[model samples]
Target: QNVGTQAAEEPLNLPISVCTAPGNCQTEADAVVLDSNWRWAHTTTGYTNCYTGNLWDTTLCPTPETCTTNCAIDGVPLADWSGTYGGSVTGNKFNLKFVTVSTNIGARTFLLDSTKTRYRMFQLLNREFTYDVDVSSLDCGLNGALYFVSMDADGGAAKYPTNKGGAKYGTGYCDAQCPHDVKWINGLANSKDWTPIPGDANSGKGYYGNCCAELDIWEANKQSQAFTTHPCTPNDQTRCEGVVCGDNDSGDRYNGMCDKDGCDFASYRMNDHTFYGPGSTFKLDSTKPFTVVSQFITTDGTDNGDFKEFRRFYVQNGVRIENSKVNFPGITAYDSITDEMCAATKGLFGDLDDHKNKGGMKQMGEAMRKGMALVMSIWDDHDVNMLWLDSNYPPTGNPSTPGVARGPCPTTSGVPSEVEVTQANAVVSFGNIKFGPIGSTV
Candidate 1:
């Protein structure tokens, strides 16, 4: 029996629905790492006191005067630094100019507070922040002391206070004591039969030492935990230690496998771990309504290296039905058409004997019209908005040639000309062929 019935009256609806306030949403604060004040200075043997005739220190010479006339000391050479050369020095303040020379490389200009005589350097690795503090002035004479402090920034200065007292007394400071004059102290003692020394901060002892010329800070948060276990191997063990990402191929995976094994390719493994692999599937439960936000098409290679392209159609069920083993031979065919057209155009009207090379209106028009007609035949399109012809192919000469003639196009001698010609059968065919989807958007 049919039970369908019409509504007795039109349903009433509210303009807006009142929703209960959502429960309190809470989030943990992001962790912090290194935080510290740093200082450092530079000194070059060629540059003397600030008042020297250096371009960085002079104020009296004319605007166009050379470096010698500007200041007493020679200013830092612009050629030595990143970009444009310029500097400013006012009393105890110094500002150096820097510029980016390329996309991947950048310049850092250091502003020195001459009076303070200290500097800091900071870096972020993974989710951890690190700091190298209290780098001393390079002005310190040979055997003179330089100090460095390394700490995490999460707890701020409260957790790792400056060694101010140690600095004043020079008691806990490491000078020419070790190789780099820099030391790292973990919570553990020296296990290699070396006696442990009680020190400031966390009560740890320095294990390795040497002439310290550079300082680097590394951090590892949960996101980078996997990488923390795998370190890259240093090119020179006597100089530095390296890091890695996954299985070590250099026989160092267990002992620092990634680095020691020189498994630079392990980065690919790390990438795979973070993302879904090919053919991974998902399922939706019954009686639930889901909505999709977006869809994507991708290609995934099979185990044998042959990849099958797929189209993932997303629906309101929040599930993506991947249609695999799809063919996109149209893309290949289109590319082949263009290549063939280019090759044919280069073969016929691109020679010096071609009419276009004769340098006359009739000749130019005849050659161009013929070549363009041939191109249209191959592609079944004739809206020739632009055309290029070259008479030179495989370009002349070896590596040292100033310029090579490689095109099969005619030389215009930098002059322009006009051409007139009678259309041929090929030209008419090009005009009559049906161009597919002339105005359709892919």
Candidate 2:
């Protein structure tokens, strides 16, 4: 059904809606509105809780177990909307349709929705996590993402020192383990030039930085936008126990590493990542509709250093691509996968003997045990948009071609390249979104 129309008084210059059929939604592929069934079967939203930023305040929202089995307004199940909510939620909001509609409808029409932001929480019940998705139509830009985010409250806070007296860098406040979200940026470019964040050398990397690991299936501009993977640690800033990373000059201890620059070297700190996936061989094609699966496991529930590895793969038409592996590319390589980053290799540097406090993997595994939420979203970013069209390269960046990536542009004019980036009006649909136990790539 047409959710709304594009009229002079209605809203935008162009109209959009879910493509129940090709071209009808003003985008592509047949689409379905995330109606009542979706609200219950697939997702949720959360209210305030202690772990959310404050410890004294009791949660006004449902706990992880409650939210997962049903939908709620403020911790109370919405009655009709409640059925078998897979997992609980703490996220603040989610969109109705069209990842984010009320704002960017220009001349193109995509999915329609409530206009007001709503629930932003949900998960697949228990540790048995699995996901298999077939998107008949996928898109980049308009900031698209689909990933699993894990959290551990107790372990997160058990040993690591936190100073969440207030929010810093807007990454939420958690003294203990935080959420590590594995994201897929279908496209990572937009309408402006993005200034790379100046390294916060003072604070160093740790839980204080952004908590995320991302994979760009088709990042625009550069390995076709390198099919890259990123796992993060604290923001690059430095601080000591109970103090903002770089707030004071007093030397303090952080985890196992004790020094001012200690946080800077932890592999878990921000500014570290690993790139996986085979070259420019795979790109989301509107006509083909591909499949993607991300599986997560936290062995030894709530135990120290839960072994976790985020594996990715693709299924086209019906054939599954050989599993794409994410192995340590080496300490000296770009996207360093140092042994210190692995929970299994905790406390040991690559040489197999030194305890430099680079043991970020230990707490990483613990955080996964705390809890996690599965999310699918799309958004936009500045700089990422223009960084590639010019003044960028492949080897230096995950480029589209060799020498073609780095070196010279192979041209003075914008010849041999014509790229189309449609952030708005972009549509992505999921099929067989699942979670399971054990390893099953198919």
Candidate 3:
């Protein structure tokens, strides 16, 4: 069934303009510049009659509601007043001054302006430090001609001990009931108790000892807008209480056993070896250039008797080889003769014979000597095993046929002798001069 249809279509072309310059404008024009002026205005009036507001009620009250959901007592809002005229007044200028009490630290005064975007302040507390913040244009415009301040008291100060008249640490600062103390069990008697000692002089006050501090600040403005005092809490969860800086007994700090030598033990026990386990069968990847300097394997003859050996090849620049010959045998004459003799007797000779030997006997002998010499040279260089012969006897009941009992190279020691190669030393060395560091065998 041919049910296909086709239509001829043309591509649409849309051209984009690439303008260097148009009209009186040249290809390159000087950059436009503008100047901005920032000024500062100081008000004469300062914060006055600051007090917490009542919760759940629109009227002013002496004490905020404690248990009623209508009003929050602890964090009730505060009201303050700033003078009408104090500092200079100009366009793009901003000036403000305010004060707030921080229970965690102490009283603080702040003077801020947008003219130079700076903050001048003093703290009537321990370890005083000045602050100068450059208020940006965006921040000044959005927040208006006033500085917003907050107070922060350490919530984790309970972990430390307090000095007399010094900072308050632990639940001592709270009322006897200590409602601020974090309690997990409600209505459970003796679920949690405050420490007997008021505070540790050696330790700083706070749950984590100086880690937690309440931030309190007063905001001042010339407009009728209400000036309020607020507490500035830490925004980072990790920097908060019950996290990194909490009571060890609460499983918050020092979660596990404190092992001072744990790191040392790990470093000391690191095994730098390539081969491990019995049989030497488990070998490290040679390409990685790891060497097994020393290893030991023990085996009982019963059911688990075993001996194993492995060869390590040195690799370099992606090239790998089992063995490396420095000078390529130096063109030994015996090797040449052996090659020629073998080629000449390729077809006619099924086995070695005197008639067809044709001086090959001498060549064979010379070749054997040269091979032995080569092996000996390697042995001497590495101080390894020298060529030698060894003999071994079969177990009883495995005796050879009666007449052929005297096998090849039979010995009176009741053992059969076969070609054996032994090494005086066990070390072997090979590879180019650049090989040792990049590729090593052990």
Candidate 4:
């Protein structure tokens, strides 16, 4: 990804806190950069777009190498954060609006350290991460995600010399899904074999997939939520192609470099419909802001130890509430995500235990130890309308099946076209980020 000198580069200031002990925190105003995909890719010295709306200009981007050299990813000014992308940071809070009237759709952002030159990396093992969230405006089919991905701190700029954009322009993104939609992979333009997604107007599929381990601290809406860990072999950001890319459309999901179907613990999918909701009756109400604490436990209670479990709890209305335990028949009653829990849930769901097959927690520990970049996004699914998260997935599956009904949302909800128009005003707020040792956060 080439950094464009045509536009002034700037990032939004987002304040966060890092704690070493109880009430011992250091607050810093970090920077937030938008993904390169959302930026304009125009010819180095021309007005014509090198890449636009899921298609690359053949004359400007005839070859991948030429495309990388010819095009540059432009930067966003301070005001564009809100005017163009519908993102704003006030004090410690960052609000990401799903739609910006007629200009934008959804947005994805990455955090930068104080220097604002590299991605802010977090070591998750044997530590706790807490944040306040407000998802009242998020509806079904919409996902306001806060997660971590095994991306290079320098956004692959050091490894790939051609990439000048680096973390400042939010490059080098990968995740458990091994997404093939990224326009660039490993700092190379993925335009040669680009194939536009039929329904998505501004994005397309590339020949390469960006693979990495992922920790999903929160993937939620007002009606449902989940925290998942996906492990992968060679967990750091890697480029994959062919069968190893885990192209779901090609019927090759499990045979890939990363685990496509992650080990998830969504209470609604565990048959607990009353666990989280918008109203006061629910245990973790979503109508108002709340604190979420997640502990990444290790085998020896140290950062060097292997990952043992991912525990979670919520503080709403000043009351602490543990995660909802599984209610499935074949699975044990477990609240947190562990190897044992993942194995049992996979077997019962009749889905391949890709999480375990891809090296599971132990491998995920490797990625955690190395550190990961923070990613916050608000997006609506185009393929399945996010049915897998907040509604009965595999749409054809019986809702009576234990692992089928993930939420109360209707199967027909989450249609991107419909929600893009109806839920245009929806927004999600994530702020007051606090990180520290396990027992120090809560």
Instruction: Report, for every candidate in turn, its global Cα lDDT versus the true structure.
Output: 0.17, 0.25, 0.17, 0.90
lDDT by residue for model 2 (245-346), tens: 222223322322212222111111111221211223443332454455444334443234344443445566666653422223332322222233332222
What would the per-residue lDDT of candidate 4 be over residues 1-442, giving only the tens digit for each residue? 7777777879989888888788889997798899988998987777678887779988888888999888888989987889999999889999999999536999999999999999889998999999999999999899999999999999999999988989988899889888988887888888868898887888888789899999999999999999999988989889988888888888988888888879999999988999999999998888999999999999999988999899999998789998999996656799999999998887888878988888888988899999999999999998889999999987889999778999989999999989998899999999999988887865
Question: Which structure is stronger by lDDT: 1 or 2?
Answer: 2
Considering summed lDDT, which 10 consecutive residues are worst modelled in model 4? 43-52
Residue pairs with clashing backbones, model 4: none
Give the clash total for candidate 1: 53
- The Cα error of candidate 1 at residue 20, in Å, is 21
Once fitted onto the true fold, the runs of candidate 1 whose alpha carbons sit more than 4 angstroms away are 1-226, 230-267, 270-442
lDDT of 3 by residue, 1-442 (tens): 0001121111111111112222111121111000000001011122111121101112321211211111111101112111211111122221222111221101111222122112211121111111111111111001111211111122122232211101111011211011112211111111122222222111111222212111111011110011111111221112223433334346433321111001000000111112211122323232222111111111221212221111123222334323211111222211111223232322222222221222222322221112110000010101101110101122121223211111121222211111111211111111111111111211
Query: Per-residue lDDT of 181-281 in model 1, one digit per residue for the tens?
Result: 12211111111212222211111122332111111111111111001111112211121123221122233223321121110111111222221111123
TM-score on alpha carbons, each prediction: 0.16, 0.38, 0.14, 0.98
| Model 2, runs deviating above 4 Å | 1-102, 105-143, 150-287, 297-305, 325-358, 386-422, 440-442
- Segments of candidate 4 deviating more than 4 angstroms: none
Better of 2 and 3 by lDDT: 2
By TM-score: ranked, best first: 4, 2, 1, 3
